[PDB]
Amino acid sequence: SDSAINVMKWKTVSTIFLVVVLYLIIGATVFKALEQPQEISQRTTIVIQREKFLRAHPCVSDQELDELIQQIVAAINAGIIPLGASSNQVSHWDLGSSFFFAGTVITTIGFGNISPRTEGGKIFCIIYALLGIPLFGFLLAGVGDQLGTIFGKGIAKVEDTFIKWVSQTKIRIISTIIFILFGCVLFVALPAVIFKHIEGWSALDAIYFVVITLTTIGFGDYVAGGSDIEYLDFYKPVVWFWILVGLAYFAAVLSMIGDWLRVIAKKTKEAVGEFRAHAAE
Amino acid sequence: SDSAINVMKWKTVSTIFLVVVLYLIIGATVFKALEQPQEISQRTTIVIQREKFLRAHPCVSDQELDELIQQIVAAINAGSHWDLGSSFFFAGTVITTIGFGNISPRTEGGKIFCIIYALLGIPLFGFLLAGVGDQLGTIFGKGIAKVEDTFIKWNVSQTKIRIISTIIFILFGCVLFVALPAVIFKHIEGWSALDAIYFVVITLTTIGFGDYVAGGSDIEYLDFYKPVVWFWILVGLAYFAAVLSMIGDWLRVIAKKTKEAVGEFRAHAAEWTANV
Ligand SMILES: CS(=O)(=O)Nc1ccc(C(=O)NCc2ccc(Cl)cc2Cl)cc1
Ligand SMILES: CS(=O)(=O)Nc1ccc(C(=O)NCc2ccc(Cl)cc2Cl)cc1
Ligand SMILES: CCCCCCCCCCCCCCCC
Ligand SMILES: CCCCCCCCCCCCCCCC
Ligand SMILES: CCCCCCCCCCCC
Ligand SMILES: CCCCCCCCCCCC
Ligand SMILES: CCCCCCCCCC
Ligand SMILES: CCCCCCCC
Ligand SMILES: CCCCCCCC
Ligand SMILES: CCCCCCCC
Ligand SMILES: CCCCCCCC
Ligand SMILES: CCCCC
Ligand SMILES: CCCCC
Ligand SMILES: CCCCC
Ligand SMILES: [K+]
Ligand SMILES: [K+]
Ligand SMILES: [K+]
Ligand SMILES: [K+]
Numbered sequence: 258s259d260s261a262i263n264v265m266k267w268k269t270v271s272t273i274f275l276v277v278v279l280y281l282i283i284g285a286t287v288f289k290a291l292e293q294p295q296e297i298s299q300r301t302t303i304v305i306q307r308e309k310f311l312r313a314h315p316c317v318s319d320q321e322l323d324e325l326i327q328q329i330v331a332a333i334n335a336g337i338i339p340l341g342a343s344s345n346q347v348s349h350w351d352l353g354s355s356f357f358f359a360g361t362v363i364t365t366i367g368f369g370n371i372s373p374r375t376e377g378g379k380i381f382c383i384i385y386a387l388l389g390i391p392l393f394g395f396l397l398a399g400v401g402d403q404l405g406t407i408f409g410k411g412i413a414k415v416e417d418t419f420i421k422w423v424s425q426t427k428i429r430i431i432s433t434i435i436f437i438l439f440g441c442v443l444f445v446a447l448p449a450v451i452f453k454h455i456e457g458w459s460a461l462d463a464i465y466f467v468v469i470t471l472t473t474i475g476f477g478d479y480v481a482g483g484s485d486i487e488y489l490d491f492y493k494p495v496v497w498f499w500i501l502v503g504l505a506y507f508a509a510v511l512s513m514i515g516d517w518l519r520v521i522a523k524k525t526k527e528a529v530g531e532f533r534a535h536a537a538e
Numbered sequence: 539s540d541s542a543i544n545v546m547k548w549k550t551v552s553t554i555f556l557v558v559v560l561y562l563i564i565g566a567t568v569f570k571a572l573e574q575p576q577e578i579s580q581r582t583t584i585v586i587q588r589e590k591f592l593r594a595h596p597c598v599s600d601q602e603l604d605e606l607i608q609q610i611v612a613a614i615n616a617g618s619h620w621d622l623g624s625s626f627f628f629a630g631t632v633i634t635t636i637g638f639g640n641i642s643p644r645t646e647g648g649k650i651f652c653i654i655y656a657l658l659g660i661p662l663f664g665f666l667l668a669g670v671g672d673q674l675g676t677i678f679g680k681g682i683a684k685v686e687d688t689f690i691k692w693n694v695s696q697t698k699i700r701i702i703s704t705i706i707f708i709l710f711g712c713v714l715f716v717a718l719p720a721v722i723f724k725h726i727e728g729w730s731a732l733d734a735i736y737f738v739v740i741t742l743t744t745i746g747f748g749d750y751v752a753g754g755s756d757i758e759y760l761d762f763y764k765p766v767v768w769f770w771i772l773v774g775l776a777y778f779a780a781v782l783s784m785i786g787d788w789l790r791v792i793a794k795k796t797k798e799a800v801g802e803f804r805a806h807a808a809e810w811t812a813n814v
């Protein structure tokens with residue numbers, strides 16, 4: 258009965274699909290609740306700034322002012338500092354910043370502050386990604402293993418001394434607390450602190466940046482290394498290492514969260530099974 | 539000997555690490571080769587536009603121009619972006635981890651929710667994309683039963699015909715999830731042929747720079763378009779997940795082969811040099 262299990266499978270995929278549809282709608286409405294207000298205040302007050310300089314200089318043709326801004330915003334995506342007081346500039350595609358970019362491709366973070374303009378750069382980026390991504394995978398997989406076997410020796414010692422007057426599958430609960438507790442210190446708390454100090458971001462922004470980057474979402478609204486500050490270059494390498502090990506960590510963490518849902522889902526599926534079966538007496 | 543296998547493992551991780559380091563350096567140098575030129579041409583010609591705009595409108599003094607650009611850079615950090623739909627789109631960029639980021643949260647609350655929404659969303663989406671995988675896999679599973687019947691009752695038989703199947707997967711696959719959608723994008727968005735395919739690959743690999751985004755400009759869109767892209771993403775992401783996984787396995791193989799080919803090169807360099 259091969260098609261008997263296939264009918265069961267399509268029934269599962271579909272309910273999850275609808276759960277995910279529903280999840281997007283909830284999310285959609287909570288984001289627009291949160292962001293539509295500040296957007297409206299900032300759009301009224303940017304038209305306030307506009308009319309102050311629109312009529313304060315009528316001798317500018319005035320259909321060309323919105324065309325000027327289009328030439329600035331188009332050119333900001335390639336990354337420019339168009340000013341008289343700072344017309345000498347650093348490079349976006351120097352030795353290092355192209356090494357950084359290559360990293361955003363293979364990890365699939367893809368911040369995208371810097372991205373290829375040349376038709377060749379795009380064609381190479383496509384080739385570089387398709388071979389790079391799988392390749393990086395194996396490293397991040399091995400970075401997983403090692404870091405796993407490190408914490409494997411770390412729980413042998415702590416599941417020896419906590420052998421008091423002891424269940425097997427309940428000491429699993431105490432281990433996974435030590436994974437999340439120490440884990441959020443090493444790959445989230447401590448690095449966010451460093452970022453707060455070095456970059457000059459808010460406490461929230463750092464942790465946000467940590468999570469957005471290590472989940473490989475990589476908006477790129479904040480980027481470590483991104484501004485022209487000073488930089489120790491003890492710094493930037495330490496971040497490469499952080500990324501290597503942080504991405505490993507979040508891969509597990511997300512995988513745990515995944516399994517918790519599996520469980521929560523059985524429970525809630527059989528709780529509805531109960532709710533129907535009693536349905537008022 | 540438990541530490542005997544651990545030393546083997548760290549030896550594996552390291553060579554891969556150095557391969558990946560080396561891969562970034564090659565890549566680094568090919569990107570800078572490619573992009574440092576266009577950067578220099580665009581920086582000269584943006585200072586040409588700057589000094590041209592003082593002269594072509596002398597009404598503007600040099601001191602108000604630097605104040606204007608500060609109000610544009612201020613306004614670049616904001617930009618409706620968060621309408622009914624575009625917040626649904628955003629939520630999608632979070633869970634798929636494409637994360638284009640054309641639209642991103644500014645409010646301290648939006649960031650805090652985004653963190654919570656991502657950590658529970660990402661794993662959840664995974665299961666769907668996993669199931670979308672299965673089904674699409676079992677569809678093409680019936681599709682190869684029929685085509686491995688009519689071609690396996692005659693010419694050159696087994697162990698080479700696996701090579702012909704995986705060509706049919708990639709050939710048809712690149713039509714449905716790369717060629718055909720890029721065409722539609724060329725027509726609808728008005729991108730170049732290259733840009734479409736670039737956008738397809740950048741998005742379906744979940745890299746998601748966001749230098750191009752389907753739906754992103756303020757054009758008349760047909761109500762039918764944007765949903766059809768949601769579906770494409772759902773099934774395209776599934777496809778590329780396998781494709782990347784294949785590419786991964788090819789490397790596994792290429793790596794054994796190249797490891798034993800060096801094993802050969804050494805072994806003759808040996809018993810050609812013992813020959814005195
Ligand atoms: C805007 S810029 O391109 O001109 N400036 C730079 C920006 C960032 C970096 C860099 O390497 N940061 C650490 C890092 C490393 C690897 C990965 Cl995947 C992610 C991260 Cl955050 C370097 C230069
Ligand atoms: C400045 S804007 O944000 O308002 N413009 C938009 C940009 C995109 C969309 C949209 O729905 N695109 C289809 C789509 C769906 C889900 C995912 Cl993950 C990716 C994609 Cl490309 C809508 C508006
Ligand atoms: C296991 C219970 C569910 C929630 C556990 C949350 C702990 C991890 C959060 C990491 C954020 C750092 C705290 C903020 C310090 C300024
Ligand atoms: C100084 C400002 C610090 C702000 C700390 C707020 C961070 C809270 C993050 C929420 C943790 C989510 C855990 C549950 C996910 C399953
Ligand atoms: C010891 C591991 C060797 C693996 C090297 C694989 C190199 C892949 C190059 C891809 C050619 C386009
Ligand atoms: C990008 C690198 C292309 C392949 C380079 C060859 C790998 C050398 C290490 C193999 C030793 C077994
Ligand atoms: C600009 C400094 C970056 C040096 C990189 C060193 C570690 C790379 C590991 C992939
Ligand atoms: C976060 C809301 C999910 C609701 C799911 C309902 C499935 C029976
Ligand atoms: C002192 C050890 C450093 C911890 C690794 C993460 C650093 C950003
Ligand atoms: C070299 C033995 C394997 C463990 C090494 C960890 C080094 C950070
Ligand atoms: C099999 C083709 C479906 C996706 C094409 C439309 C996406 C732009
Ligand atoms: C047109 C340049 C091609 C780079 C591989
Ligand atoms: C919020 C989840 C509801 C599942 C029945
Ligand atoms: C707007 C969501 C529809 C997905 C097919
Ligand atoms: K921008
Ligand atoms: K991204
Ligand atoms: K991005
Ligand atoms: K990603």
Ligand SMILES: [K+]
Pocket residue numbers: 365366367473474475635636637744745746
């Ligand atoms: K991404």
